[PDB]
Amino acid sequence: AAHVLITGAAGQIGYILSHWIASGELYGDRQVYLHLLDIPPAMNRLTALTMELEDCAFPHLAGFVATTDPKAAFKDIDCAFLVASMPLKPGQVRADLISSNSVIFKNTGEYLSKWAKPSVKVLVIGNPDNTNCEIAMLHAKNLKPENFSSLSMLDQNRAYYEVASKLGVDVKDVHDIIVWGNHGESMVADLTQATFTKEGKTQKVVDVLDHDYVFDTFFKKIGHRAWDILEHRGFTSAASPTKAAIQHMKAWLFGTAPGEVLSMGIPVPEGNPYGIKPGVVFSFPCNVDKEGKIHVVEGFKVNDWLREKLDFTEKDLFHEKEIALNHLAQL
Amino acid sequence: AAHVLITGAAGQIGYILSHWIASGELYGDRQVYLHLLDIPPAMNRLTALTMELEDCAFPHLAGFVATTDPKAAFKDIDCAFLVASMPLKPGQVRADLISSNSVIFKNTGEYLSKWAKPSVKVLVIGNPDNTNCEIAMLHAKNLKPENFSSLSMLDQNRAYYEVASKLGVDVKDVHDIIVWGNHGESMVADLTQATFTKEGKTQKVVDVLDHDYVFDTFFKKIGHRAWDILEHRGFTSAASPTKAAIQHMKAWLFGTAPGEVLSMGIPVPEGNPYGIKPGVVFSFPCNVDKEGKIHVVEGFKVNDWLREKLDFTEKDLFHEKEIALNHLAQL
Numbered sequence: 327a328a329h330v331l332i333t334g335a336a337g338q339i340g341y342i343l344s345h346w347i348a349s350g351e352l353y354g355d356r357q358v359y360l361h362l363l364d365i366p367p368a369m370n371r372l373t374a375l376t377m378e379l380e381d382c383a384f385p386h387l388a389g390f391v392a393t394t395d396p397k398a399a400f401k402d403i404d405c406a407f408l409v410a411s412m413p414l415k416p417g418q419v420r421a422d423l424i425s426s427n428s429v430i431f432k433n434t435g436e437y438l439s440k441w442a443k444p445s446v447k448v449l450v451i452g453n454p455d456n457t458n459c460e461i462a463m464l465h466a467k468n469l470k471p472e473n474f475s476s477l478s479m480l481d482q483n484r485a486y487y488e489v490a491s492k493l494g495v496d497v498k499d500v501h502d503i504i505v506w507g508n509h510g511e512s513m514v515a516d517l518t519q520a521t522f523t524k525e526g527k528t529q530k531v532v533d534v535l536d537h538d539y540v541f542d543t544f545f546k547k548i549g550h551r552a553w554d555i556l557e558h559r560g561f562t563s564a565a566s567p568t569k570a571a572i573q574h575m576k577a578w579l580f581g582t583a584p585g586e587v588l589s590m591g592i593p594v595p596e597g598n599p600y601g602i603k604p605g606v607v608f609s610f611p612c613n614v615d616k617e618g619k620i621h622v623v624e625g626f627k628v629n630d631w632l633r634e635k636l637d638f639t640e641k642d643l644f645h646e647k648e649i650a651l652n653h654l655a656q657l
Numbered sequence: 658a659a660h661v662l663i664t665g666a667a668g669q670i671g672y673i674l675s676h677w678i679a680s681g682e683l684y685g686d687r688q689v690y691l692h693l694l695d696i697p698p699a700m701n702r703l704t705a706l707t708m709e710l711e712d713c714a715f716p717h718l719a720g721f722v723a724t725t726d727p728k729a730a731f732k733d734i735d736c737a738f739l740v741a742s743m744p745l746k747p748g749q750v751r752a753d754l755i756s757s758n759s760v761i762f763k764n765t766g767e768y769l770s771k772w773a774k775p776s777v778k779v780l781v782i783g784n785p786d787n788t789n790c791e792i793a794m795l796h797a798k799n800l801k802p803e804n805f806s807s808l809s810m811l812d813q814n815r816a817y818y819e820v821a822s823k824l825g826v827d828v829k830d831v832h833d834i835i836v837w838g839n840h841g842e843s844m845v846a847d848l849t850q851a852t853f854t855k856e857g858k859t860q861k862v863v864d865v866l867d868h869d870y871v872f873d874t875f876f877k878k879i880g881h882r883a884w885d886i887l888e889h890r891g892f893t894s895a896a897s898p899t900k901a902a903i904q905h906m907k908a909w910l911f912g913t914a915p916g917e918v919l920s921m922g923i924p925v926p927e928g929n930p931y932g933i934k935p936g937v938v939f940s941f942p943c944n945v946d947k948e949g950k951i952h953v954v955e956g957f958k959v960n961d962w963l964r965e966k967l968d969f970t971e972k973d974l975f976h977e978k979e980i981a982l983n984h985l986a987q988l
């Protein structure tokens with residue numbers, strides 16, 4: 327009954343994402359109808375995808391449609407995973423995709439506004455996803471900022487596992503790790519809020535791990551992680567962001583758990599308590615109520631170190647916006 | 658607590674299989690410890706795999722070990738997914754991999770016998786999997802035939818979806834479709850047993866779909882399916898067999914549901930009711946009791962058509978065994 331869209335479905339992420347969702351991991355007992363969008367030169371792998379979906383005999387898959395037509399893909403969808411993208415060339419960073427992906431998400435915003443449900447929940451994955459989310463949201467007349475978000479939970483999950491290994495505890499035993507701002511080079515892996523509990527006793531991460539590790543070694547490691555996977559894999563990540571994206575969407579759809587804080591790129595809400603200026607999509611510490619509305623988690627402290635990092639990634643986001651939107655105007 | 662082995666983990670199937678299992682889809686609430694085996698020239702992607710597993714922050718993943726050392730991979734494992742294989746060249750069929758994969762599974766059988774638990778459940782995926790399963794089982798002194806099985810459920814799931822589309826019902830509404838014998842060119846997609854129910858009324862498939870479709874069009878389609886995916890994907894299937902393999906193993910571990918029949922390649926049991934001779938691994942209609950023991954489902958009818966098909970694929974299996982084991986002897 328639930329209609330889920332996946333753009334760039336024929337790609338590496340779309341391949342796994344479609345199967346995992348069809349398995350019933352997103353909507354549980356409720357069936358899913360997959361809208362699979364891609365482009366004609368990828369029509370082969372797109373068909374290859376559907377055939378394998380068919381070959382799973384998923385009882386949670388009510389049906390699907392694989393197309394290159396926007397309308398067929400976006401019509402009356404309940405949520406969307408925007409994974410569409412051109413190839414990231416060797417040696418490039420996420421921001422280098424602005425020139426080739428900006429138009430895609432400009433059009434996507436229009437498609438969403440034109441055909442998707444007003445309650446559509448759009449999760450942007452394709453890089454630069456914070457920016458691409460800004461593009462789509464801007465060019466969606468009939469939709470609001472609350473309909474859009476970008477994926478930063480891969481960064482948080484990276485941070486969670488890393489910190490967990492150094493503290494000698496499980497991931498579930500750590501709390502309030504946050505990745506602020508852009509899912510890019512300037513991402514801010516923040517541990518100044520973080521705590522962990524072991525055998526009844528709670529400790530602050532900064533009081534247990536040395537300064538040099540927390541603010542340099544760790545900070546660098548999380549930012550560079552995506553390229554470390556690329557070095558060993560020969561391609562950027564795929565299975566891990568798929569997991570983060572399903573985790574992200576599921577929380578967005580049905581709400582978060584007690585004490586759960588998720589790094590979610592959202593259009594900067596006016597009156598946010600962390601001094602970030604509106605105009606971009608910014609990763610905040612977020613929760614989601616049982617009616618599916620994201621809320622920035624209040625109460626976290628911003629010392630001089632974090633303030634500077636937030637300013638840097640904020641400046642970075644507004645810069646990407648300048649370059650991206652200017653490219654569209656001339657385009 | 659449950660230790661799961663995956664050979665050829667760095668490959669396409671091992672990539673998805675590892676993540677999906679780590680998600681908790683195999684052992685549910687019980688944690689999993691992944692033994693990830695591959696070869697040094699694939700050490701890069703093997704590390705790339707672990708990094709992404711780490712980057713998921715799976716709460717069901719207790720830990721893992723990625724190695725090229727047999728002992729570290731096979732020690733005290735509870736079950737194994739044998740996916741290890743050399744590349745399948747263009748234009749080849751599954752049986753063409755005998756020359757390059759036979760030794761792998763000869764050694765694997767020895768590793769299993771030497772280090773794995775006596776209760777280990779070994780699922781063979783790497784092609785030719787029926788044969789490769791025969792190789793491993795033969796060269797495992799301390800283990801029994803009941804410890805080994807090969808994957809044919811991808812064929813059944815293919816058959817189920819196909820038949821479902823033509824009957825205008827869901828997959829869950831169809832029953833007793835079977836794929837007998839070899840997971841190869843000679844595979845027998847049998848619908849002579851099949852039925853389906855719609856709105857209280859049950860019908861036999863052969864009484865609803867025309868003869869020409871059932872015994873020619875359908876029979877050919879399921880056999881050729883693997884190469885049809887290859888045509889469109891550029892590689893053989895990966896996500897769909899991963900699903901079938903997890904489905905297969907889960908049923909093998911915790912038993913099947915009422916009326917559920919699964920095509921499972923097992924060492925031909927002496928005294929099977931369908932006249933198949935011992936000495937090979939043969940796909941039978943199977944169920945599994947709540948203590949995890951596979952049983953060939955009795956009661957199915959074998960008309961002249963099926964008998965001939967069974968003889969052909971049986972002959973095919975004994976032929977593959979001749980070629981494979983002879984290659985090992987000279988090797």
Ligand SMILES: NC(=O)C1=CN([C@@H]2O[C@H](COP(=O)(O)OP(=O)(O)OC[C@H]3O[C@@H](n4cnc5c(N)ncnc54)[C@H](O)[C@@H]3O)[C@@H](O)[C@H]2O)C=CC1
Nearest residue numbers: 334336337338339364368410411430452453477480563567
């Ligand atoms: N947010 C995150 O944490 C992560 C994001 N990514 C990003 O995800 C994106 C895709 O990753 P992969 O699946 O590995 O790449 P891929 O190249 O395998 O897939 C991209 C797909 O988008 C399609 N596409 C291109 N233009 C399109 C258009 N106008 N409309 C519809 N579809 C179109 C292509 O045909 C292709 O199938 C990349 O931009 C990458 O940077 C990758 C890893 C993690």
Ligand SMILES: NC(=O)C1=CN([C@@H]2O[C@H](COP(=O)(O)OP(=O)(O)OC[C@H]3O[C@@H](n4cnc5c(N)ncnc54)[C@H](O)[C@@H]3O)[C@@H](O)[C@H]2O)C=CC1
Nearest residue numbers: 665667668669670695699741742761783784808811894898
């Ligand atoms: N049963 C079924 O329904 C299906 C079976 N397959 C079979 O699965 C096998 C693998 O498929 P893919 O993952 O796509 O292939 P792949 O080539 O991506 O992966 C095979 C992996 O096995 C590894 N390997 C090779 N020799 C080894 C050894 N001695 N020990 C440990 N690892 C070794 C390789 O390094 C490689 O990473 C193939 O033989 C293919 O025919 C494929 C599709 C469906």
